[PDB]
């Protein structure tokens, strides 16, 4: 993005003042769209000394004469050249500027435009800057942030001591990672992405994308009329234990509800019988076990069951103990099919095994399992997309790191998912996702594509729940999945 602006000025030849003008007017238009007619409102524009503030000056100047009142509070010391220019325009146009903030000031304005810091923020905000942000946050006024709410680090989404909470953020060219990852995602409020005149080839060159409806629509496999269950693939899910008899059911149904032709579960007897008593469509193979858990004595039966399926999912509700550990690593070492490795299969996994595998793999950890997997803290891995990138690349796999914003990466391409809600914050929801991913691989999507489509549809199904989200359970989510698919087209 810094790249993008520079190239658009330096190689394409667009005057930096023109980009700055387009930036500011796009903020005005976004506010009009969100607030209706702007002439009834009084606007307090907060401008730093950088180009974020310059953008602010453009906004203030364009409100002059058209709205009830404009005031700029200039908070910087030095001004960049474009900020200086635009400051001089605002003044020539008759705009009033002050240099000291008095708490009482929010009293006489309806909208605060936050142009203090954007992508040029470095390190923590303190001093006057922090007080003013805390005042704005306590004011209950409408807050529109220019580019990113001031205080959010645009590369990570972290709050640098304190940050503005916006009702509306107008960002330029492309969403920034700090709009996408929390807490920043929360502080952004409603996000508008404005076209300010970058050539389209530059906008498209960016390595990380948010997963969209259009991308997922184009990835959904085709349903030829002359087809049968074989057309849509077979999944084996190796799952469950005597502690967890339900997980396998949720995974298997996740596969069926996204359109897989045939799903076989392998589950310790008698827990395997639980699946068909809820959903008779599922096939649930009883695996004879010594203590209610998969072990090495079951290895050959499972490789045999895997011989004429398209994909194998393993992990949900297996339990984490040494017999499971032995079994999972020998299985994965010998299985020459794509694998979706989840849950307790991740908790026992030996990552050397992923390197010596010829067939592909998707790993689906929440941060707690990722932390354990790479031997780091939850805090070190949460939302750490570069870490996920390095791991996907080292181990020749797709890593789906699950959280309110899920990261899907293969080490080259990284995608962020922003669908879903807190109804998914409840056990079972991940077990469903695993089945969805395995299912899309069975139907012919690549691992990365299957994962992109699945995370998106899984979150969208949760949002379609009719009642309060907190009451959503995994069984209900399964039922919403084909509605999500329909609404997708």
């Amino acid at each position: 993005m810094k790249e993008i602006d520079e190239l658009t000025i330096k190689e394409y030849g667009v005057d930096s003042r023109i980009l700055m003008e387009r930036a500011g007017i796009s903020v005005v238009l976004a506010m009009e769209e969100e607030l209706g007619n702007l002439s009834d409102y009084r606007f307090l524009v907060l401008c730093g000394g950088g180009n974020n503030g310059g953008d602010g000056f453009v906004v203030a100047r364009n409100l002059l004469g058209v709205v009830k009142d404009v005031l700029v509070v200039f908070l910087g010391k030095k001004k960049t050249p474009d900020c200086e220019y635009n400051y001089g325009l605002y003044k020539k146009f008759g705009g009033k500027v002050v240099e000291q903030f008095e708490p009482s000031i929010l009293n006489e304005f309806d909208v605060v435009v936050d142009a203090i810091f954007g992508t040029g923020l470095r390190g923590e905000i303190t001093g006057e800057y922090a007080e003013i942000i805390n005042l704005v946050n306590k004011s209950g006024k409408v807050v529109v942030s220019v580019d990113v709410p001031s205080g959010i680090d645009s590369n990570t989404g972290k709050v640098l001591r304190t940050a503005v909470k916006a009702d509306l953020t107008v960002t330029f060219g492309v969403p920034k990672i700090g709009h996408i990852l929390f807490p920043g995602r929360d502080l952004t409020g409603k996000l508008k992405v404005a076209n300010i005149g970058h050539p389209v080839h530059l906008i498209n060159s960016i390595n990380r994308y948010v997963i969209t409806r259009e991308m997922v629509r184009s990835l959904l496999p085709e349903r030829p009329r002359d087809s049968h269950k074989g057309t849509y693939g077979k999944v084996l899910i190796i799952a469950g234990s005597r502690l967890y008899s339900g997980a396998p059911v949720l995974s298997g149904m996740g596969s069926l509800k996204v359109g897989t032709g045939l799903v076989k579960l392998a589950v310790p007897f008698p827990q395997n019988l639980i699946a068909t008593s809820r959903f008779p469509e599922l096939i649930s193979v009883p695996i004879d076990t010594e203590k209610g858990f998969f072990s090495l004595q079951n290895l050959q039966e499972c490789l045999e069951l895997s011989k004429d399926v398209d994909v194998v999912a393993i992990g949900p509700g297996l339990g984490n103990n040494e017999h499971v550990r032995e079994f999972v690593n020998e299985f994965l070492k010998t299985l020459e099919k794509p694998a979706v490795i989840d849950a307790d299969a991740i908790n026992v996994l030996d990552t050397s095994v992923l390197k010596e595998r010829k067939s592909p793999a998707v790993l689906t950890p929440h941060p707690g399992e990722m932390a354990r997997l790479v031997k780091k803290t939850v805090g070190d891995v949460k939302y750490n997309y570069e870490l996920a990138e390095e791991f996907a690349k080292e181990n020749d796999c797709v890593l789906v790191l699950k959280s309110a914003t899920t990261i899907v990466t293969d080490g080259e391409k990284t995608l962020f998912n922003i669908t879903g809600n807190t109804g998914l914050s409840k056990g079972g929801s991940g077990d469903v996702l695993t089945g969805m991913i395995a299912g899309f691989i069975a139907q012919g999507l690549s691992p990365l594509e299957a994962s992109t489509v699945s995370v998106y549809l899984h979150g969208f199904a949760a949002e379609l729940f009719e009642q309060d989200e907190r009451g959503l359970t995994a069984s209900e989510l399964l039922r919403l999945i084909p509605e999500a698919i329909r609404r997708l087209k």
Partner: peptide, 7 residues
């Protein structure tokens, strides 16, 4: 809805 255009 009138900042850019008048009809």
């Amino acid at each position: 809805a009138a900042w850019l255009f008048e009809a």
